[PDB]
Amino acid sequence: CGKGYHLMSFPQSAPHGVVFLHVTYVPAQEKNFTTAPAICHDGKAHFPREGVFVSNGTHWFVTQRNFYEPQIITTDNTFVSGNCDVVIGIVNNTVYDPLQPELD
Amino acid sequence: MSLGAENSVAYSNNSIAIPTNFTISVTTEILPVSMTKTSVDCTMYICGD
Amino acid sequence: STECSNLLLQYGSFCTQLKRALTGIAVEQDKNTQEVFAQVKQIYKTPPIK
Amino acid sequence: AARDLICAQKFNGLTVLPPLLTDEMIAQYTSALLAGTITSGWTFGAGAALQIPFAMQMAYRFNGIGVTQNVLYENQKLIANQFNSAIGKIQDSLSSTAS
Numbered sequence: 127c128g129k130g131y132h133l134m135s136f137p138q139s140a141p142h143g144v145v146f147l148h149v150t151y152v153p154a155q156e157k158n159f160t161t162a163p164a165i166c167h168d169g170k171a172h173f174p175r176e177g178v179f180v181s182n183g184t185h186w187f188v189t190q191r192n193f194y195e196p197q198i199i200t201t202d203n204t205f206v207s208g209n210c211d212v213v214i215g216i217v218n219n220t221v222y223d224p225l226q227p228e229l230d
Numbered sequence: 231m232s233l234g235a236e237n238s239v240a241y242s243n244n245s246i247a248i249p250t251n252f253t254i255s256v257t258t259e260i261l262p263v264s265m266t267k268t269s270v271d272c273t274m275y276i277c278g279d
Numbered sequence: 280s281t282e283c284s285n286l287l288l289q290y291g292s293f294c295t296q297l298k299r300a301l302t303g304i305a306v307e308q309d310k311n312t313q314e315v316f317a318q319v320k321q322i323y324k325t326p327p328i329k
Numbered sequence: 330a331a332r333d334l335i336c337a338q339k340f341n342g343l344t345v346l347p348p349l350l351t352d353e354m355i356a357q358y359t360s361a362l363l364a365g366t367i368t369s370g371w372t373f374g375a376g377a378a379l380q381i382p383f384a385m386q387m388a389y390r391f392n393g394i395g396v397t398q399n400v401l402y403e404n405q406k407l408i409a410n411q412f413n414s415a416i417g418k419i420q421d422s423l424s425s426t427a428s
């Protein structure tokens with residue numbers, strides 16, 4: 127139903143037929159970013175829960191795939207699996223823990 | 231005839247492209263459903279009274 | 280043969296509708312190939328790194 | 330002296346029309362689809378081609394089928410070797426069996 131990600135459709139009658147008006151979503155304005163599969167922090171491999179890791183040149187963020195809305199990489203949007211000796215292309219960065227200012 | 235414009239995707243193993251905006255597009259699809267129902271009398275066609 | 284053509288002209292429009300059916304089939308084959316393979320808008324190509 | 334059936338077909342008024350798209354253009358369409366799928370994923374089928382590394386594209390596919398992406402990232406060499414073995418088996422089965 128249309129080209130792009132389908133949202134809605136509307137029917138209209140026609141002589142000997144039907145006409146579908148397909149409302150779809152199309153991505154528009156692209157931008158290049160530096161990406162990594164996982165992040166090695168304290169000898170632990172962090173993978174994004176839903177999204178990808180992007181970099182604008184200096185800092186690293188986590189973003190949903192279909193729209194650019196960067197977020198600070200925390201422990202509430204990443205998960206830990208193994209060490210950082212297996213994944214090819216892993217980068218070194220920090221992962222913020224929200225409980226640390228709560229304890230301090 | 232031309233199959234289309236030539237494009238080259240800038241592939242790399244540490245580079246990604248992420249959209250920053252969007253477009254809401256409405257397109258049209260036309261489908262036939264039914265045709266004309268006809269009826270033929272053989273005696274009127276072949277012979278005609 | 281001219282005599283065969285002159286007696287064939289009395290059978291009506293069988294030849295024209297047979298020709299129309301065959302032309303419709305021939306156009307439909309190219310339509311099938313175009314709607315299967317021509318689904319991409321731009322001719323993409325792979326970078327020389329492999 | 331060796332008469333052909335195509336000659337009799339032509340001499341009796343039966344002709345074969347060539348197709349509009351030659352096999353080189355069909356191969357070009359196939360190569361464009363392959364290059365788009367390899368270099369961008371499914372993004373070229375919904376709009377402009379967004380580039381992505383192929384390992385992260387396979388992580389997208391693994392998350393699509395219901396498996397966590399660390400299964401891919403910790404078994405990348407095994408999956409690549411299995412894919413290459415399957416493609417070589419496709420080659421050998423096409424080279425051997427003609428049915």
Ligand SMILES: *[C@@H]1O[C@H](CO)[C@@H](O[C@@H]2O[C@H](CO)[C@@H](O)[C@H](O)[C@H]2NC(C)=O)[C@H](O)[C@H]1NC(C)=O
Pocket residue numbers: 182183184185
């Ligand atoms: C990448 O993003 C980071 C985070 O937004 C940028 O760091 C900020 O840069 C602005 C300058 O416009 C400063 O005012 C902020 O104080 C910076 N934030 C921090 C936490 O240091 C960074 O400049 C961006 N880099 C590029 C090349 O665009």
Ligand SMILES: *[C@@H]1O[C@H](CO)[C@@H](O[C@@H]2O[C@H](CO)[C@@H](O)[C@H](O)[C@H]2NC(C)=O)[C@H](O)[C@H]1NC(C)=O
Pocket residue numbers: 155250251252
């Ligand atoms: C995303 O795209 C929309 C339109 O596709 C942009 O909205 C336009 O912005 C310009 C500049 O301010 C205005 O002159 C136009 O009138 C706007 N059009 C509409 C329909 O509102 C929007 O600015 C874009 N956003 C980003 C972040 O690029």
Ligand SMILES: *[C@@H]1O[C@H](CO)[C@@H](O)[C@H](O)[C@H]1NC(C)=O
Pocket residue numbers: 156157158240247
């Ligand atoms: C990203 O980098 C490539 C590298 O050549 C460049 O061609 C392209 O314009 C850049 N921007 C986008 C949005 O793809």
Ligand SMILES: *[C@@H]1O[C@H](CO)[C@@H](O)[C@H](O)[C@H]1NC(C)=O
Pocket residue numbers: 216217218
């Ligand atoms: C990440 O840090 C470790 C030590 O903590 C170091 O051995 C490794 O080389 C670093 N990674 C990169 C890509 O520099």
Ligand SMILES: *[C@@H]1O[C@H](CO)[C@@H](O)[C@H](O)[C@H]1NC(C)=O
Pocket residue numbers: 214215243328329
């Ligand atoms: C990434 O790509 C470059 C060039 O294609 C290649 O030399 C390199 O081995 C690849 N992998 C990594 C981890 O850099």
